[PDB]
Amino acid sequence: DVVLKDQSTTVDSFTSYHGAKPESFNAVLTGIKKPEKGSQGNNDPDWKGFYTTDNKHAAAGYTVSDESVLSGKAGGVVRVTYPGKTRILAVKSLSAAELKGKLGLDSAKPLIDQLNDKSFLEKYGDGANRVVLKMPFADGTEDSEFIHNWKDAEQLSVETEVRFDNLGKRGQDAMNSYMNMANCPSSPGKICLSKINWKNVREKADALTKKVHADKEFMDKLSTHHQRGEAPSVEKTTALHNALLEHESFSALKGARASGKVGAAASTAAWGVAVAQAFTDPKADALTKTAATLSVVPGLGQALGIADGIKHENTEEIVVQSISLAGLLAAQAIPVVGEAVDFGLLVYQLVETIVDLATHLSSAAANPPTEATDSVRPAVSLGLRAGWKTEEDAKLHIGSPYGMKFQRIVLSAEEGKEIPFVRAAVAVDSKFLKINGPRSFVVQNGIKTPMACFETEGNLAFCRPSRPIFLSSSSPATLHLSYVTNEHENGTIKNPTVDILGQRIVENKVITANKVSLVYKVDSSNTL
Amino acid sequence: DVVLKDQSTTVDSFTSYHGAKPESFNAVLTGIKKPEKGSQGNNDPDWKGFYTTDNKHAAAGYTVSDESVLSGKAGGVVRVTYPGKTRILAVKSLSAAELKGKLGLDSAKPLIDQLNDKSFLEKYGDGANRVVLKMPFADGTEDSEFIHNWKDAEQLSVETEVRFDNLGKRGQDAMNSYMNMANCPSSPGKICLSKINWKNVREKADALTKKVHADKEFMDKLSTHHQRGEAPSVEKTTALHNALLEHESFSALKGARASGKVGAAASTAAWGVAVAQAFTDPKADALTKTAATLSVVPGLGQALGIADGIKHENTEEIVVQSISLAGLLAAQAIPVVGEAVDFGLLVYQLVETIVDLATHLSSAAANPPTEATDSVRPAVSLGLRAGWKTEEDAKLHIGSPYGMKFQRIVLSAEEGKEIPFVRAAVAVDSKFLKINGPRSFVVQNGIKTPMACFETEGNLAFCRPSRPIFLSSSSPATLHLSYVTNEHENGTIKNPTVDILGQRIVENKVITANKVSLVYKVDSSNT
Numbered sequence A: 001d002v003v004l005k006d007q008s009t010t011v012d013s014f015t016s017y018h019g020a021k022p023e024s025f026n027a028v029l030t031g032i033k034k035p036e037k038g039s040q041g042n043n044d045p046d047w048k049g050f051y052t053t054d055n056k057h058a059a060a061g062y063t064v065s066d067e068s069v070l071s072g073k074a075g076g077v078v079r080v081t082y083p084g085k086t087r088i089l090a091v092k093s094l095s096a097a098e099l100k101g102k103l104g105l106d107s108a109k110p111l112i113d114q115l116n117d118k119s120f121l122e123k124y125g126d127g128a129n130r131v132v133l134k135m136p137f138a139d140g141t142e143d144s145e146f147i148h149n150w151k152d153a154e155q156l157s158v159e160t161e162v163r164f165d166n167l168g169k170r171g172q173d174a175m176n177s178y179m180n181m182a183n184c185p186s187s188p189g190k191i192c193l194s195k196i197n198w199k200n201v202r203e204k205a206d207a208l209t210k211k212v213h214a215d216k217e218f219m220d221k222l223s224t225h226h227q228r229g230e231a232p233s234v235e236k237t238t239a240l241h242n243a244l245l246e247h248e249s250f251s252a253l254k255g256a257r258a259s260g261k262v263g264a265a266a267s268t269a270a271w272g273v274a275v276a277q278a279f280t281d282p283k284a285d286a287l288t289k290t291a292a293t294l295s296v297v298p299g300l301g302q303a304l305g306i307a308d309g310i311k312h313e314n315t316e317e318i319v320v321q322s323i324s325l326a327g328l329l330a331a332q333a334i335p336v337v338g339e340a341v342d343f344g345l346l347v348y349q350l351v352e353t354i355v356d357l358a359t360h361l362s363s364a365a366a367n368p369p370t371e372a373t374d375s376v377r378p379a380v381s382l383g384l385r386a387g388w389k390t391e392e393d394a395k396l397h398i399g400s401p402y403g404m405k406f407q408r409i410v411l412s413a414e415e416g417k418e419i420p421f422v423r424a425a426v427a428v429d430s431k432f433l434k435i436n437g438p439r440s441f442v443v444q445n446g447i448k449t450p451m452a453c454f455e456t457e458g459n460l461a462f463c464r465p466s467r468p469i470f471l472s473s474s475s476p477a478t479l480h481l482s483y484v485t486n487e488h489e490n491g492t493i494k495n496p497t498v499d500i501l502g503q504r505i506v507e508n509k510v511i512t513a514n515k516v517s518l519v520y521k522v523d524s525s526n527t528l
Numbered sequence B: 001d002v003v004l005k006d007q008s009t010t011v012d013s014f015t016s017y018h019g020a021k022p023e024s025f026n027a028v029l030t031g032i033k034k035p036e037k038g039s040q041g042n043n044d045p046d047w048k049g050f051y052t053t054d055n056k057h058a059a060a061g062y063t064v065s066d067e068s069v070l071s072g073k074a075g076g077v078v079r080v081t082y083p084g085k086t087r088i089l090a091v092k093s094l095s096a097a098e099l100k101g102k103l104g105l106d107s108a109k110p111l112i113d114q115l116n117d118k119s120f121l122e123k124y125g126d127g128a129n130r131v132v133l134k135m136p137f138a139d140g141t142e143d144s145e146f147i148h149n150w151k152d153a154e155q156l157s158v159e160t161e162v163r164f165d166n167l168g169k170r171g172q173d174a175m176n177s178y179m180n181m182a183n184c185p186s187s188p189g190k191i192c193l194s195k196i197n198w199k200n201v202r203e204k205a206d207a208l209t210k211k212v213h214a215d216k217e218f219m220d221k222l223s224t225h226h227q228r229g230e231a232p233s234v235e236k237t238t239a240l241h242n243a244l245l246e247h248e249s250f251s252a253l254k255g256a257r258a259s260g261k262v263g264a265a266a267s268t269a270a271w272g273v274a275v276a277q278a279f280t281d282p283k284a285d286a287l288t289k290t291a292a293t294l295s296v297v298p299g300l301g302q303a304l305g306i307a308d309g310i311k312h313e314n315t316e317e318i319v320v321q322s323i324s325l326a327g328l329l330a331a332q333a334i335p336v337v338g339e340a341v342d343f344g345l346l347v348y349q350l351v352e353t354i355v356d357l358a359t360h361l362s363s364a365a366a367n368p369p370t371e372a373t374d375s376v377r378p379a380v381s382l383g384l385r386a387g388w389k390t391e392e393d394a395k396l397h398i399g400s401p402y403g404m405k406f407q408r409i410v411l412s413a414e415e416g417k418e419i420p421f422v423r424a425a426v427a428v429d430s431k432f433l434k435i436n437g438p439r440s441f442v443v444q445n446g447i448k449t450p451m452a453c454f455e456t457e458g459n460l461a462f463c464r465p466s467r468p469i470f471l472s473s474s475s476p477a478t479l480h481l482s483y484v485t486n487e488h489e490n491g492t493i494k495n496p497t498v499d500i501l502g503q504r505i506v507e508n509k510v511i512t513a514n515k516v517s518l519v520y521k522v523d524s525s526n527t
Ligand SMILES: [Ca+2]
Pocket: A036
């Protein structure tokens, strides 16, 4: 009895949501159709289909472009409704081969592509015009996901729920604010952020930092505490922090910063030192590649006190003032080699980059923890911690029914640490093992973030979060890696591991990324 | 067909050499006997026996104490001779179970413990009084090793070849000098170091650094280039290096250092910054735990130009002056937190620690490379590189015939780097997997260094080289990991990996060791 009647329903005018990337939103709005380019929902042919969700906020998080990193460009969410009655069939989390057999399908054709079988429809349809499969394989969310037959999905009426592609590189600002709207009235840990307008934050922080560095009298005194380009220490960076807090423009934040109510001088100073060390990387560029470096420096949230700032009565001002101070501090501390860049343009880029990162962090900080901290055989390194969800997750089955496999890894940090999750390195083999990017995600505090996976095809592949992910004890994350297996004989994996890459390491101009490695067992038994 | 006639011989008054640690040398000298404490040559009962070598210089390298790290204490080498005739039986590198069956021994008893079987003696002895097995499983050296039956070994006459246990913490000075004597008259790259007296180097470097730091006029001028305890930079450290080199006491090295003939100012300056950062570790201590930190900081050899200094005509003076400058430079750059340590005592401890390390490094520098640089699936991290010797090495067989297994890993650095090989973390299981320390070693430039292995018994084990090993492209090393497997049912390995730990990493007072990890395949098949 593979059907789960308690979750299966028959719905009239069935409506669900689908998030589309900038390149695909316009084609999706004009009609749902199997794309010729891409994976068509799954690298496993059995599960190829149109994927929707009952959570329009979760669909909004799948509008981020994965063309670039921190591009700020988003697509939009479509509301898709069927004519007539639809059967949402819930089934057990089993392999497609087993599902095909227990539901009376042909084993030699894809499972989802057969949801419109005449015989299958009569037996399980409950009289409905079609059947849409509720997603068997799990997700960290309390949301429900649906897999549609590609030919059936052509019958959907498509409408715009929300779109961000007309905002250009400010689209993800609106996506972040729209997703957070699930926390707003009509929940002690769930914070509504409606009092923060990201356009206000960017414009006010740009004005505030401009007024400060245009005060030549004040800026010269800032040269006594620290001279731009010289080696910055925690003592120098802390004094530079408090010298900046003395300016009239930071009066709303001075008290709360000095007391620990919003952040701490020691947290911003430690982040400033780490930002200056990270920019000694010859490949880095503070003016033209600001996001690349700031994205891999730990503790940006605590350098802003963002978890504190979003609960303050004067929220927008506190956030503007905390971001402004951190931008001015980083610009004063960043190493100078050769001709120094224009300080005003440097502060502008630093403020812009900080806001690009704070938006995503503020969304995660407004949500209570949802992911387990317990793992099997955790690995730790420089604050970074990764472990297997359960014993069963530390496995890869390349035999028996071939197809979609899953691996769940617990991602966290040591107490007081905030580690960027940059990417995961996984094993692939062009003959029999594929990474399944569209179906890979990371769950943190109820937010589901898609993964963008690329091929080195030296039997290695890299997967990166399409949105910045920072790991802490208070915000543990679960990485859901999806693989696809196909039929082979005598195939093997010489490196059965998963690498977790974090913050940048710098030792005497030499650069690497913080890494932890987990090892799994490869099962080649085609018995089960 | 297991017998190798081309390598088997029949010898009268067969003599070989055995290196004993400080704790065991005196009991070995009075007679050879199976020790009640320890592994008795091998954690595998089949291979338990007395182990000797035909190379007395390699035996000297197995006299170092493994009680402590960089203790400077060594035991000695005994020359052991049998009465009458001995047959050295060379056999193929096979498992003891296969050897026992093919040689007509009982399969239910230890192999080496059966070398005095009457039938075995008659068939394979060639008329000799005993049979001594040449070590089947390999080693990187061109030396020959012999495995003796423990009851047979009681017949050996024991003499002293050389001993170092009367030198206290200076035994390894003489052991290093005695081992290098294999390069001395009676190949361009093999360097004889007979012109260096390590006791002179310590005495002269202590005198030289004292004369400098007792020069208040000169020392005050050194506070302008750098003030003790202040943030060390590469630029500041380089100027500190050149300011020290201007002193009259460094005139014999000033020219060669400035030109690159012996080291380079940038090499000494980079090491000084890294030493200063490493001593920001809250657990480190520059005065009482100097060796602990200096042992895990890359590039000590190039900070001395040791490979150049040992080829110089004025060898001892160049080496004395090179060590003196690095000690004064490091003492000037090391962070000062709280009450500062006495500057003279810090320079003293830094000079002695550098000499404690330079002796081993100079021995490796006097030898041409012998180990391959090509490996299977190398892993790299911050200059550290480790790979499997061959595809067969990336495997562990816990089934089939149980017993002694081997894993060879190629260890090197990236071009221009000198990475300390601190230790290797391996997997063990009290039920079926044991680390086999006595038979684990690392070979670098023809020198065989013993491994000391300890237990976490959380399914992990740590093995460290008993002498400092620094990895470079010009001095590749091969780590020989030895395991023992025993009979088990359903035993499994959750972490089939080997960690290789190198230099210390420093991030905002946070400390870890540079690590590279290799993964092998576990085979439980009963072939
Ligand atoms: Ca096509």
